[PDB]
Design goal:
With 232 residues, this protein is of the alpha+beta class. Helices cover 26% and strands 21% of the residues. The protein is built from 5 helices and 8 strands. The chain has helices spanning 30-40, 50-68, 106-115, 121-129, 206-216, and strands spanning 23-27, 84-89, 94-99, 151-159, 166-170, 175-180, 189-196, 224-226. It has an 8-stranded mixed beta sheet with strand order 1-6-5-4-7-3-2-8. A hairpin with a 4-residue loop joins strand 5 and strand 6. It binds adenosine-3',5'-cyclic-monophosphate (CMP). It is classed as chaperone.
């Protein structure tokens, strides 16, 4: 039956097979759960230092590239720049910290981002009770959780040369999940996506982001770049 022209909907290609993502759910180590509750539900005056904490994690992951080269020169062949990108999305109310560091395996997410007790956790909670500044968090080993000063939910997408791409996610409440991520490949590195709380939207503003980077993170050691969406 002759055709001279087809509608879009007719030549619509059949979907790729549905992907299966394996998901697992884990409880946070008891004292990590306690700290996340404390961080979430207490007022702190200097919440901006969350960005100094995640930038530091990124910087540490990038320093690992340079040293891992000494025992695996393969990585010198990568053409990827060692850098950090800050991506506020006013539309979705997210701030995303992206790096091209070494990334995390599945077991690294499960162990490093919640299941293994940290020996400073108790001491830091005591310090906060006794009125320490929240800024001291990173010296107690638990600075990743400062994300929950500003974020109601945090998703971490990551890819390590030794594993497949995974997503960790938690809205606190005592648990997190790790799942395989068959979504947009990142190549190598980690993206931390902060879903900001309703009253913490100043961290999507480019001036505010520039201010806190200048104040707290001016020895990162790698280029940091802020992507600003053009105002329509
Ligand atoms: N951007 C990142 N890249 C690689 N690993 C990270 C990143 N963010 C957090 N982590 C891991 O999570 C850990 C949290 O505690 P640490 O800073 O001691 O060590 C950190 C890393 O192991």
């Amino acid at each position: 039956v002759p055709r001279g022209s087809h509608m879009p909907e007719e030549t619509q290609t059949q979907d790729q097979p549905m992907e299966e993502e394996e998901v697992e759910t884990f409880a946070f180590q008891a004292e990590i759960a306690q700290l996340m509750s404390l961080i979430i539900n207490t007022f702190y005056s200097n919440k901006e230092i969350f960005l100094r904490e995640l930038i530091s994690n990124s910087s540490d992951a990038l320093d690992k590239i340079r040293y891992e080269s000494l025992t695996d020169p393969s990585k010198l062949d990568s053409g990827k720049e060692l850098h950090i990108n800050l991506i506020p999305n006013k539309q979705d109310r997210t701030l995303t910290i992206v790096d091209t560091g070494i990334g995390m395996t599945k077991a690294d997410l499960i162990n490093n981002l919640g299941t293994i007790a940290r020996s400073g956790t108790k001491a830091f909670m005591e310090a906060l009770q006794a009125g320490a500044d929240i800024s001291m968090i990173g010296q107690f080993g638990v600075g990743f959780y400062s994300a929950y000063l500003v974020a109601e939910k945090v998703t971490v997408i990551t890819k390590h040369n030794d594993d497949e791409q995974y997503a960790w996610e938690s809205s606190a409440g005592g648990s997190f999940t790790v799942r395989t991520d068959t979504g947009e490949p990142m190549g190598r590195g980690t993206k931390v996506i902060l879903h900001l709380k309703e009253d913490q939207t100043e961290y999507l503003e480019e001036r505010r982001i520039k201010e806190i980077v200048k104040k707290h993170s001016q020895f990162i050691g790698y280029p940091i770049t802020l992507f600003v969406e053009k105002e329509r």
